[PDB]
Motif scaffolding. Structure first.
Motif, PDB file in Angstrom:
ATOM      1  N   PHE A 120       0.821  -1.207   0.000  1.00 51.25           N
ATOM      2  CA  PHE A 120       0.000   0.000   0.000  1.00 51.25           C
ATOM      3  C   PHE A 120       0.856   1.259   0.000  1.00 51.25           C
ATOM      4  CE2 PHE A 120      -2.167   3.254   2.630  1.00 51.25           C
ATOM      5  CZ  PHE A 120      -3.146   3.607   1.725  1.00 51.25           C
ATOM      6  N   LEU A 121       1.945   1.264   0.768  1.00 44.03           N
ATOM      7  CA  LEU A 121       2.822   2.425   0.805  1.00 44.03           C
ATOM      8  C   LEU A 121       3.712   2.524  -0.420  1.00 44.03           C
ATOM      9  CD1 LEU A 121       3.796   2.450   4.570  1.00 44.03           C
ATOM     10  CD2 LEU A 121       2.222   3.951   3.357  1.00 44.03           C
ATOM     11  N   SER A 122       3.817   1.451  -1.204  1.00 44.83           N
ATOM     12  CA  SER A 122       4.403   1.509  -2.531  1.00 44.83           C
ATOM     13  C   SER A 122       3.359   1.703  -3.619  1.00 44.83           C
ATOM     14  CB  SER A 122       5.208   0.238  -2.819  1.00 44.83           C
ATOM     15  OG  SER A 122       4.355  -0.888  -2.911  1.00 44.83           O
ATOM     16  N   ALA A 123       2.072   1.535  -3.303  1.00 45.94           N
ATOM     17  CA  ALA A 123       1.027   1.947  -4.234  1.00 45.94           C
ATOM     18  C   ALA A 123       0.959   3.465  -4.319  1.00 45.94           C
ATOM     19  CB  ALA A 123      -0.319   1.352  -3.817  1.00 45.94           C
ATOM     20  N   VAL A 124       0.951   4.135  -3.167  1.00 47.84           N
ATOM     21  CA  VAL A 124       1.277   5.554  -3.104  1.00 47.84           C
ATOM     22  C   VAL A 124       2.790   5.696  -3.273  1.00 47.84           C
ATOM     23  CG1 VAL A 124       0.705   7.685  -1.784  1.00 47.84           C
ATOM     24  CG2 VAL A 124      -0.566   5.566  -1.384  1.00 47.84           C
ATOM     25  N   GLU A 125       3.231   6.906  -3.655  1.00 44.90           N
ATOM     26  CA  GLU A 125       4.547   7.358  -4.133  1.00 44.90           C
ATOM     27  C   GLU A 125       4.754   6.915  -5.582  1.00 44.90           C
ATOM     28  OE1 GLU A 125       7.809   6.063  -1.786  1.00 44.90           O
ATOM     29  OE2 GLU A 125       9.232   7.634  -2.350  1.00 44.90           O
ATOM     30  N   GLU A 152     -10.662  -2.348   0.434  1.00 50.57           N
ATOM     31  CA  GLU A 152     -10.449  -3.591   1.169  1.00 50.57           C
ATOM     32  C   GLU A 152     -10.188  -3.334   2.645  1.00 50.57           C
ATOM     33  OE1 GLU A 152      -7.334  -5.729  -0.708  1.00 50.57           O
ATOM     34  OE2 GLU A 152      -8.590  -6.509  -2.331  1.00 50.57           O
ATOM     35  N   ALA A 153      -9.675  -2.148   2.991  1.00 52.88           N
ATOM     36  CA  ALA A 153      -9.478  -1.803   4.396  1.00 52.88           C
ATOM     37  C   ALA A 153     -10.803  -1.669   5.137  1.00 52.88           C
ATOM     38  CB  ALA A 153      -8.677  -0.508   4.514  1.00 52.88           C
ATOM     39  N   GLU A 154     -11.858  -1.242   4.442  1.00 55.72           N
ATOM     40  CA  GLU A 154     -13.177  -1.160   5.061  1.00 55.72           C
ATOM     41  C   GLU A 154     -13.776  -2.543   5.284  1.00 55.72           C
ATOM     42  OE1 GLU A 154     -15.581   1.246   2.599  1.00 55.72           O
ATOM     43  OE2 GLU A 154     -14.731   3.152   3.270  1.00 55.72           O
ATOM     44  N   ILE A 155     -13.626  -3.439   4.307  1.00 61.15           N
ATOM     45  CA  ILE A 155     -14.273  -4.745   4.380  1.00 61.15           C
ATOM     46  C   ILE A 155     -13.557  -5.641   5.384  1.00 61.15           C
ATOM     47  CG2 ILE A 155     -14.940  -6.781   3.062  1.00 61.15           C
ATOM     48  CD1 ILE A 155     -15.030  -4.940   0.579  1.00 61.15           C
ATOM     49  N   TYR A 156     -12.239  -5.756   5.259  1.00 61.67           N
ATOM     50  CA  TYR A 156     -11.438  -6.546   6.180  1.00 61.67           C
ATOM     51  C   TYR A 156     -10.401  -5.663   6.856  1.00 61.67           C
ATOM     52  CZ  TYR A 156     -13.362 -10.704   3.888  1.00 61.67           C
ATOM     53  OH  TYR A 156     -14.206 -11.665   3.379  1.00 61.67           O
ATOM     54  N   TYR A 157     -10.076  -6.006   8.101  1.00 66.60           N
ATOM     55  CA  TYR A 157      -9.022  -5.316   8.846  1.00 66.60           C
ATOM     56  C   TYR A 157      -7.671  -5.950   8.511  1.00 66.60           C
ATOM     57  CZ  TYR A 157     -12.783  -3.082  11.445  1.00 66.60           C
ATOM     58  OH  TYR A 157     -13.895  -2.352  11.800  1.00 66.60           O
ATOM     59  N   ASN A 158      -7.278  -5.777   7.250  1.00 67.69           N
ATOM     60  CA  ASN A 158      -6.082  -6.400   6.700  1.00 67.69           C
ATOM     61  C   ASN A 158      -4.885  -5.458   6.739  1.00 67.69           C
ATOM     62  OD1 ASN A 158      -5.801  -8.679   3.818  1.00 67.69           O
ATOM     63  ND2 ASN A 158      -4.505  -8.383   5.625  1.00 67.69           N
ATOM     64  N   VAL A 159      -5.080  -4.200   6.353  1.00 72.96           N
ATOM     65  CA  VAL A 159      -4.029  -3.189   6.344  1.00 72.96           C
ATOM     66  C   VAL A 159      -4.562  -1.960   7.060  1.00 72.96           C
ATOM     67  CG1 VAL A 159      -2.606  -1.669   4.915  1.00 72.96           C
ATOM     68  CG2 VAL A 159      -2.973  -4.014   4.211  1.00 72.96           C
ATOM     69  N   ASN A 160      -3.813  -1.464   8.039  1.00 71.61           N
ATOM     70  CA  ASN A 160      -4.142  -0.179   8.632  1.00 71.61           C
ATOM     71  C   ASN A 160      -3.693   0.939   7.702  1.00 71.61           C
ATOM     72  OD1 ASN A 160      -1.466  -0.825   9.071  1.00 71.61           O
ATOM     73  ND2 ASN A 160      -1.448  -0.263  11.239  1.00 71.61           N
ATOM     74  N   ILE A 161      -4.575   1.915   7.495  1.00 68.57           N
ATOM     75  CA  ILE A 161      -4.259   3.020   6.595  1.00 68.57           C
ATOM     76  C   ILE A 161      -3.180   3.899   7.215  1.00 68.57           C
ATOM     77  CG2 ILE A 161      -5.219   4.863   5.195  1.00 68.57           C
ATOM     78  CD1 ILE A 161      -7.732   2.618   6.754  1.00 68.57           C
ATOM     79  N   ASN A 162      -3.202   4.039   8.539  1.00 71.79           N
ATOM     80  CA  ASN A 162      -2.194   4.820   9.257  1.00 71.79           C
ATOM     81  C   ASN A 162      -0.979   3.945   9.570  1.00 71.79           C
ATOM     82  OD1 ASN A 162      -5.054   6.198  10.616  1.00 71.79           O
ATOM     83  ND2 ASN A 162      -3.572   7.429   9.472  1.00 71.79           N
ATOM     84  N   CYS A 163      -0.377   3.428   8.508  1.00 72.44           N
ATOM     85  CA  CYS A 163       0.820   2.611   8.609  1.00 72.44           C
ATOM     86  C   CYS A 163       2.016   3.458   8.208  1.00 72.44           C
ATOM     87  CB  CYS A 163       0.711   1.347   7.752  1.00 72.44           C
ATOM     88  SG  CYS A 163       0.442   1.593   5.988  1.00 72.44           S
ATOM     89  N   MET A 164       3.037   3.445   9.047  1.00 75.19           N
ATOM     90  CA  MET A 164       4.176   4.327   8.892  1.00 75.19           C
ATOM     91  C   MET A 164       5.248   3.636   8.059  1.00 75.19           C
ATOM     92  SD  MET A 164       2.918   6.840  10.690  1.00 75.19           S
ATOM     93  CE  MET A 164       4.204   8.007  11.117  1.00 75.19           C
ATOM     94  N   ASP A 165       6.088   4.438   7.416  1.00 73.22           N
ATOM     95  CA  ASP A 165       7.343   3.936   6.889  1.00 73.22           C
ATOM     96  C   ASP A 165       8.296   3.679   8.054  1.00 73.22           C
ATOM     97  OD1 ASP A 165       6.817   3.769   4.193  1.00 73.22           O
ATOM     98  OD2 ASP A 165       7.268   5.888   3.830  1.00 73.22           O
ATOM     99  N   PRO A 166       9.460   3.063   7.806  1.00 81.19           N
ATOM    100  CA  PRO A 166      10.518   3.082   8.834  1.00 81.19           C
ATOM    101  C   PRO A 166      11.100   4.466   9.159  1.00 81.19           C
ATOM    102  CG  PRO A 166      10.820   1.195   7.424  1.00 81.19           C
ATOM    103  CD  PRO A 166       9.715   2.004   6.806  1.00 81.19           C
ATOM    104  N   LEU A 167      10.622   5.559   8.543  1.00 81.49           N
ATOM    105  CA  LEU A 167      11.134   6.905   8.788  1.00 81.49           C
ATOM    106  C   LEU A 167       9.948   7.840   9.027  1.00 81.49           C
ATOM    107  CD1 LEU A 167      13.298   5.475   6.516  1.00 81.49           C
ATOM    108  CD2 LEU A 167      14.225   7.793   6.847  1.00 81.49           C
TER     109      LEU A 167
END
Lengths: 48, 74
Positions: free
Chosen positions: B8-13, B26-41
């Motif tokens: 997801f963070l490589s889908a953006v950029e 898919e984030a609404e349907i299943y709790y698979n990926v949190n949208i507020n997921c950080m990079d390592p920085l």
């Protein structure tokens, strides 16, 4: 606990400074040239 | 980070309006990926859509319940 925060915001400040202070060069020109060129041949290959 | 969170963070950029929107639906349907997921920085998906001046991914994220906190300054 302090050193982790200093390293984290240090590295964030250094990548920020590399984004602001790095001047553009010839290889960055070649990257745009290949992006427009590759997107060109891809659209021409879809429409051909 | 999960491999789908990095997807997801490589889908953006990259400027996707399809795979980003598919991941946010898919984030609404299943709790698979949190949208507020950080990079390592640091670097949430909203901040990635701010450093690359793309307003469509910003509207697409801000239509969802993204943590907007302290990201107006960026």
């Amino acid at each position: 606990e302090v050193i982790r925060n200093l390293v984290k915001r240090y590295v964030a400040a250094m990548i920020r400074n590399s984004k602001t202070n790095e001047g553009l060069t010839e290889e960055n020109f070649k990257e745009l040239k290949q992006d427009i060129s590759s997107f060109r041949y891809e659209v021409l290959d879809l429409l051909g | 980070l999960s491999a789908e969170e990095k997807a997801f963070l490589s889908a953006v950029e990259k400027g996707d309006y399809a795979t980003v929107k598919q991941a946010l639906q898919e984030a609404e349907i299943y709790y698979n990926v949190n949208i507020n997921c950080m990079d390592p920085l640091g670097r949430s998906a909203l901040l990635i859509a701010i450093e690359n001046e793309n307003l469509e991914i910003m509207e697409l994220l801000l239509n969802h319940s993204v943590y907007v906190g302290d990201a107006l300054l960026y």
